[PDB]
Amino acid sequence: DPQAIPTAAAVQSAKVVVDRLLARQTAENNNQWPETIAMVLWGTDNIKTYGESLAQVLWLVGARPLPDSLGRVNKVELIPLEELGRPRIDVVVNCSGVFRDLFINQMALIDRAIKMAAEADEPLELNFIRKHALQQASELGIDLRQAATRVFTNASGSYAANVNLAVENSSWEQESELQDMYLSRKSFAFSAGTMQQARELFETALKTVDVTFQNLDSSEISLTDVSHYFDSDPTKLVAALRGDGKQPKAYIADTTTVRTLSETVRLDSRTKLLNPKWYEGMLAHGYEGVREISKRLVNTMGWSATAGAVDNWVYEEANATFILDEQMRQRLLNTNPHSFRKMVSTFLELHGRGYWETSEANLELLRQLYQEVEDKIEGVE
Ligand SMILES: [K+]
Numbered sequence: 517d518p519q520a521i522p523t524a525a526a527v528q529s530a531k532v533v534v535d536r537l538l539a540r541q542t543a544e545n546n547n548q549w550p551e552t553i554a555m556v557l558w559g560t561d562n563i564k565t566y567g568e569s570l571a572q573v574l575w576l577v578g579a580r581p582l583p584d585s586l587g588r589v590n591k592v593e594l595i596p597l598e599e600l601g602r603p604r605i606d607v608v609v610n611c612s613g614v615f616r617d618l619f620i621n622q623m624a625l626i627d628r629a630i631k632m633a634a635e636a637d638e639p640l641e642l643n644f645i646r647k648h649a650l651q652q653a654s655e656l657g658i659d660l661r662q663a664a665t666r667v668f669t670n671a672s673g674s675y676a677a678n679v680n681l682a683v684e685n686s687s688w689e690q691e692s693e694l695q696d697m698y699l700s701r702k703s704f705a706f707s708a709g710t711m712q713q714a715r716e717l718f719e720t721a722l723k724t725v726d727v728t729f730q731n732l733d734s735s736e737i738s739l740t741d742v743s744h745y746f747d748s749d750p751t752k753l754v755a756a757l758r759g760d761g762k763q764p765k766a767y768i769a770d771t772t773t774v775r776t777l778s779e780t781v782r783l784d785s786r787t788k789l790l791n792p793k794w795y796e797g798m799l800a801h802g803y804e805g806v807r808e809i810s811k812r813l814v815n816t817m818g819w820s821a822t823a824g825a826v827d828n829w830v831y832e833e834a835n836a837t838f839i840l841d842e843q844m845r846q847r848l849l850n851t852n853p854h855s856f857r858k859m860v861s862t863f864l865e866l867h868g869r870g871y872w873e874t875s876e877a878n879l880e881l882l883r884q885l886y887q888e889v890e891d892k893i894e895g896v897e
Contacts, residue, residue: 522567530571634664680743806852
C-alpha cells in the first residue's frame with residue numbers, strides 16, 4: 517500500500533542511520549558536512565521496512581512526512597533549520613526500476629520535498645540543495661525547480677546499469693565504458709507517466725557528490741551474494757566526472773540488526789569467499805558449489821571496478837586458498853572444470869586490470885593452469 521510509507525517507526529529508525537552516517541563523515545573529514553550524498557532506493561527493502569531508506573532521504577533534505585487520518589502520506593513539509601540542527605544535505609536519489617514500478621507516488625513526494633528545500637529562504641551554508649540548485653540554474657540556463665531535479669531511475673520499462681552484465685561478460689577495456697553505461701541508463705528523471713532523459717543534469721548533480729551510500733542486510737543478501745549492489749555503485753563514476761577527480765567516501769548501512777564500503781567488503785570476504793565454513797558449505801553441493809565460488813570472485817571484482825573497494829590482500833588470499841593449495845585446486849578442477857576455468861580467468865583478469873598485484877610465479881602458474889583445464893575441457897568435448 518504505497519501511501520502507507522513511511523511509517524513513524526520507519527521515520528524514527530531512519531533518523532538514527534542518517535545521524536550515524538553524517539557523524540562518521542564529519543568526524544573523518546575535518547568536521548566538514550558532505551554537500552551531496554548519492555544513494556540507491558531499492559523497492560523490495562522499502563516494502564519490508566515500511567519506507568526506511570525513503571525516510572532517510574527525507575531526513576537528509578530536512579523533510580518530514582504527514583500521515584492523514586487513513587495513514588496515507590500524501591504531503592511533506594520542511595523541518596525548520598533550528599529543528600534540523602545541521603544543513604539540508606543535497607541527495608542524488610537513484611531509484612531502482614522496481615522502486616519506480618511500485619512507488620511513482622513516493623518518487624513524486626521526494627521530488628516535492630527537494631524542490632521545497634531549494635526554494636526555501638535560508639542561508640546557503642545550511643541548505644546545500646539551494647546552494648547547488650542556484651549554481652546549477654545559472655550554469656545550465658534553466659529554472660531553480662528544474663535545476664532541483666534529484667529523483668533518477670531507469671527508462672520506463674528498463675532495469676539496472678548493465679555494469680553487472682559488463683563485469684560478468686568481461687566485455688570492457690576501460691572503467692570509462694562501465695561509467696558511460698551507467699550514465700546512459702540511470703539518467704531518467706521523475707517530473708510532474710514518463711521518465712524524461714536528463715543526462716546533463718544527472719552528470720551536473722553527480723559532480724557535487726561527496727558521499728555514496730546504500731542500505732543492505734548482509735545477513736540476507738550480502739554485498740557479494742549478487743551483482744546488483746556494485747551495478748548501482750557510482751563511487752568511481754563521481755571521481756571520473758568531477759573536475760577535481762575526488763572519489764567520494766562510500767558507506768553501507770548493514771540492516772542485519774553504518775560502515776565504509778571498504779570495511780563492508782573486508783567483513784564479507786572473510787565471512788564468505790575466504791571463510792572455510794562458507795566455501796566447504798558450497799562444495800557440499802558439488803558442481804553448483806564451484807559455480808557459487810566463481811560467482812563470489814566475479815562480484816568481488818565488480819566492487820574493484822565500481823569503487824576500488826577491494827584490498828589486494830583479498831585477491832592474494834583467494835589465490836592462496838583456491839589455486840596455490842594443490843589439494844583444493846584439484847577438488848575445484850575435478851568437481852567443475854568449467855567454473856574452475858572461469859576462476860582461473862578471473863584471477864588473470866584481475867591482474868590484467870591492475871586490481872590484483874601478485875608474483876610472476878603466481879601468474880605463470882595461473883596461465884599454466886588455464887592451458888591445462890582448456891586441454892581437459894576439450895578432452896571430453
Ligand atoms: K534497477
